[PDB]
Amino acid sequence: VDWRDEPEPSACEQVSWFPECTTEIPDTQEMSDWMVVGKRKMIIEDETEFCGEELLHSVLQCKSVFDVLDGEEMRRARTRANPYEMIRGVFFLNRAAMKMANMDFVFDRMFTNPRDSYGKPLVKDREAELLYFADVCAG
RNA sequence: GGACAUACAUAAAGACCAGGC
């Protein structure tokens, strides 16, 4: 695997979206048979329905190369190899806060300043309205 | 995937003996 043919590390991130869902929202009658119960599968190597077999086997092999390695040796190499590792948490309690800071920039402040379909802010700091949010599995 | 034991303290006790006023 030639890893040296990687694009120069950048603070500029690109977003590709799914198309806009043109189908109706599935109802209770449409979904009535959608829940298939089968044998408990604990195999990931044959899950090729949405990824080419050669890429799936290659990423699984590249993961399992680390199973024989000391975790502190892996962690030290990773800290040198990741161009973004010096960001960390800055002044926040952990590096997860910086993921939300990054994504709230990349997604046009849609979380910290959400908008209606006409592009108007749903919360104005001078009016009696609060930005309600939830944070789950988030300790 | 830090200390002045500034604890001045070796003072045996006990005894007899010698001298001082």
Residue A36 annotated as part of some ligand binding site? no
Resolution of the model in angstroms: 3.9
Please, are residues A59 and A1 in contact by the beta-carbon 8 Å criterion? no
Whether CB of A81 is under 7 Å from strand B: the answer is no
Nucleotide with minimal C1' distance from the CA of A60 is: B1
Distance A59 CA to B4 C1' (A): 72
Distance A114 CA to B14 C1' (A): 103
